[PDB]
């Protein structure tokens, strides 16, 4: 049946296989007519040099412009022949190439895919075309303020590290960019073991690995500095002013990463548009709906390899900024001391739900593996996560937050019309309570 305890038990397990040249193989059988076929690569900007900045990004567009065996636009005209959707995306710490398809024609898929991974048509026809679009887009990118401030955010904490740099990289490089340097980075980091392969669907493990089928896969990092600081772009014309505030935290692999998953879930989030009103349990969603001290906000977590990011992102009236803050320091600080096991539970349940929730669907299932592999390896400790949940304690959360919050140096990002936002020296004194 479906019973939460038993519900953990029966799942198609993590599968693993390993080829010779460093390629990884892995899978899970969902008993489904379709398969998400995907690839994840750990080559980052944090690898990329100061010219390489944004190049792999530029590269990202290029694969589908045609390849070695398949010149321009002969690539997709086979793809859509099957009717199988196709997509690719990249990230500072990862890049994921993947396919969503019926399990039938997969024998082509990976072979199609394998061609793309390395064999590529590097043709300055596409280059200039793509060189333009990016440049076109580079300027357009000022339209979504969200992404904008984060760029500021990293650079202010991680200054002096390749991690602190634009994903697309600065503009002039893209013009200056030449496809030989690509071929470098093409050759550099697209080797295995850097490469990793997974999939999920009706696919069985060995019927994956057999048709993982002989093609090829392949043949530097530093701990980053953390900057107590501030950045402000003051532009007063705009109606609203985003805010972001955070402190650094543990990397991907680390015990406490889960212990802090809940504190966010507990403190929760608010938005203009909820039907929750003023009776919600989250003090923030109660007040921020009550006096509409903000339009909305949400809290984030991002844990890098060695690093982690805890903080929120809010939007409030140009006269309402201060009061959002003096509230927001309330919640974190009060947790570190006076918190209680009751509210723990309501946080505990949610994260269980959110965990179980995201686990439906081919691609997301497929998608965990790749990062997880590049992160914890094969580990998909599904039922364990539950056991992991049972670990967390009142002291734990307090003792955890005591570390990473009380009397620390926070980072401050801002975007105009900021001006109200108090000076740092307030925020700093505002981190540690005086016992009030």
């Amino acid at each position: 049946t479906a019973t939460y305890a038993q519900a953990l038990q029966s799942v198609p397990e993590t599968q693993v296989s390993q080829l010779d040249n460093g390629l990884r193989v892995a899978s899970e059988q969902s008993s489904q007519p379709t398969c998400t076929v995907g690839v994840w690569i750990d080559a980052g900007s944090r690898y990329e040099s100061e010219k390489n900045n944004g190049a792999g990004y530029f590269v990202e567009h290029l694969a589908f412009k045609g390849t070695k065996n398949r010149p321009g636009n002969a690539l997709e005209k086979e793809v859509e022949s099957m009717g199988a959707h196709l997509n690719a995306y990249s990230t500072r710490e990862h890049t994921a190439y993947y396919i969503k398809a019926l399990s039938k024609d997969l024998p082509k898929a990976v072979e199609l895919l394998a061609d793309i991974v390395q064999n590529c048509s590097l043709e300055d026809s596409q280059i200039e075309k793509e060189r333009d679009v990016i440049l076109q887009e580079l300027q357009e990118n000022d339209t979504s303020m969200r992404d904008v401030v984060f760029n500021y955010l990293h650079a202010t904490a991680f200054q002096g590290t390749p991690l602190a740099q634009s994903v697309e990289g600065p503009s002039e490089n893209v013009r200056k960019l030449s496809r030989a340097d690509l071929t470098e980075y093409l050759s550099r980091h697209y080797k295995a073991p850097r490469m990793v392969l997974a999939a999920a669907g009706g696919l069985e493990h060995r019927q994956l690995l057999d048709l993982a089928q002989k093609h090829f896969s392949g043949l530097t990092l530093s701990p980053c500095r953390f900057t107590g600081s501030q950045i402000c772009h003051r532009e007063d014309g705009l109606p609203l002013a985003h805010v972001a505030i955070a402190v650094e935290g543990p990397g991907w692999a680390h015990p406490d990463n889960v212990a802090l998953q809940v504190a966010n879930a507990i403190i929760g989030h608010y938005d203009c548009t909820y039907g929750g009103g003023a009776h919600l349990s989250s003090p923030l969603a109660s007040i921020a709906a009550t006096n509409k001290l903000c339009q909305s906000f949400q809290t984030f977590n991002i844990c890098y390899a060695d690093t982690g990011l805890l903080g929120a992102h809010f939007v409030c009236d140009h006269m309402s900024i201060d009061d959002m803050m003096f509230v927001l320091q309330g919640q974190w600080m009060r947790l570190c001391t006076s918190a209680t096991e009751s509210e723990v539970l309501r946080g505990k349940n949610l994260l269980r739900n959110a965990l179980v929730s995201h686990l439906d669907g081919t691609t997301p299932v497929c998608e965990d593996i790749g990062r997880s592999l590049l992160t914890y390896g094969r580990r998909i400790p599904l039922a364990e996560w539950e056991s992991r949940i049972a670990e967390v304690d009142a002291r734990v959360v307090r003792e955890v937050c005591s570390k990473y919050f009380y009397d620390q140096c926070p980072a401050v990002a801002g975007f105009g019309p900021i001006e109200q936002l108090p000076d740092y020296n307030r925020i700093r004194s505002g981190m540690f309570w005086l016992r009030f």
Binding site: Y406, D407, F432, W433, L434, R435
Partner: protein, 62 residues
Amino acid sequence: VAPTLTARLYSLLFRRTSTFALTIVVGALFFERAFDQGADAIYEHINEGKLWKHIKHKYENK
């Protein structure tokens, strides 16, 4: 490798502001007891036999 007393100290005391406040009075107490006791010697070291403390011994209780 051991932490310099600084790394000990905040973790030990300065972290909780109460403690951070608490120690303040504590040493301040022992401070003055010792502190004033030193300067007077220095003071009376400077002035020798100008004070009854030195002088009055000549005639004190005969």
